[PDB]
Each structure stands twice: as structure tokens, then as C-alpha cells.
């Protein structure tokens, strides 16, 4: 670990001689060890690296139920491999196969994660709005009570006079 010493040497000065902040980077950086280039998609697609089993119909809940049932049936077929021919080539495919299935079951529900994120903003806004109105109504009731309180005390005072 080290401390940037050249810029801290730069900072000890007066007048306008100190330095300005650096401009914003809109391209590849190298923070840490990863790159973290900007304009990235939050969910990088499945077509970048692995196969894709599902079409663009993509109605998430049906395909998640399909992938659940496919995981269970491929486990049963792996049991059929272990019963019939353990020395087959297919088990290596099978021990790859359900792996791909498991990847997709994660990769679909990660696609619920932006949506969940957006949706929590929505309900936060609704709760925010409601709380504002509640305080408004609360305060107005207090205001009314204070007014009538003042009124009845004023209603008391000529009765003393």
C-alpha cells in the first residue's frame, strides 16, 4: 500500500497554484483490478458466453417452471445413467447438462433484479406521498383545535368583561 505523494506535494501552495479536480471519465477505467467500463448493461446477456435454450417469447414465470421441471427430469435421467451404463460418455454431458440448466435458473431470476429495484422506488414514492399528506392532515387538525381553543378563550373574556 502507498500514498499518492506527487499530488500531495502539488497541494501545498497558495494563490491559485493548487490543482483542479480531474474531469469525469466516460470510458474504460481500471479501478481495483477489474476494468468496469461504463455504459455496461446491469444484466450481461446469456448469449455472451453460454448457450440459450429459450426464445424471445420469454414469459419468465412459464420458463422458470419449465426449467424447474427440466432440472428434476434431468436428475432422474442422470439416475438412469447411473443405473444402466455408468461408463457412458453421456454422463459427462449430463453432468454438464443440468449445470447449464442451473445457470439459466439463476440467469432468469437475476433479470428480476432490475425490475425489483425499479419497483421498490415506486413503492417508496407512494409511501413518501402518503406520509406527506398524513402529516398535512395531522397538522391541519391541530391547527383547527388551536383556532377553536383561542376562540373559546376569547369567548370567555368579554364574559369576564
Amino acid at each position: 500500500m502507498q500514498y499518492i505523494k506527487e499530488y500531495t506535494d502539488e497541494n501545498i501552495q497558495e494563490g491559485l497554484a493548487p490543482k483542479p479536480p480531474p474531469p469525469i471519465k466516460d470510458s474504460y477505467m481500471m479501478f481495483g483490478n477489474q476494468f468496469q467500463c461504463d455504459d455496461l448493461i446491469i444484466r450481461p446477456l446469456e448469449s455472451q458466453g453460454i448457450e440459450r435454450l429459450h426464445p424471445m417469447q420469454f414469459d419468465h414465470k412459464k420458463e422458470l417452471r419449465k426449467l424447474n421441471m427440466s432440472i428434476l427430469i434431468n436428475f432422474l435421467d442422470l439416475l438412469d445413467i447411473l443405473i444402466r451404463s455408468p461408463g457412458s460418455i453421456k454422463r459427462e454431458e449430463k453432468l454438464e447438462d443440468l449445470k447449464l440448466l442451473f445457470v439459466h435458473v439463476h440467469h432468469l431470476i437475476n433479470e428480476y433484479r432490475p425490475h425489483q429495484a425499479r419497483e421498490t422506488l415506486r413503492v417508496m414514492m407512494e409511501v413518501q406521498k402518503r406520509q406527506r399528506l398524513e402529516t398535512a392532515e395531522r397538522f391541519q387538525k391541530h391547527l383547527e383545535r388551536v383556532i377553536e381553543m383561542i376562540q373559546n378563550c376569547l369567548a370567555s373574556l368579554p364574559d369576564d368583561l
Partner: protein, 97 residues
Amino acid sequence: LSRNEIIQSYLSRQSSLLSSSARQLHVLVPQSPPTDLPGLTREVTQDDLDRIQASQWPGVNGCQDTQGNWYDWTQCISLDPHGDDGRLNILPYVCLD
């Protein structure tokens, strides 16, 4: 890895069941051909936003249920998909604050 014993296997059992968990399931939801931006393409209107704010919409504003009880996104749903005493407890979807 090398050896699994009665007590350790039962430990695996209780840990896996405590992680995981007359019908009382959610009411089934069909496929949805009208979706708002891609599918049906509604020009931004107003009935949809009023439905998403005030009314009950079972795919968007909450999860409905058999025995009638409505649950929106910030609540936790208690169900029993099996015929046992063990109850599934779906946690809230949003968890505000």
C-alpha cells in the same frame, strides 16, 4: 465428504428444511398477451396508472390468494403448499427500509 453419520445426516436434514420451509396456494395467473410497452403498446393513458395506484391488480400490485386474502409487495405471505404443519413463509418482495 468421506463419511456421513446419523447425527450429521439429520443435521443436514434440519438445516436444509429450515432454509427451504386443503391447499392455500396463490391463485394461478395465466399468460399475459397484453403487456403495456411491448405487447399491447398502449399510448401512455391513465386507466393503467390509476389501476396500478388504487385498485387490485394481481400481477402488478400484489399476490392474490385462495381464502381471499390480498398481499401487496411489502407484506410477507404465509402459506402451506403441503399437507403438513410446516408453513412456507414467502418474505416481502420489496422490504421498504
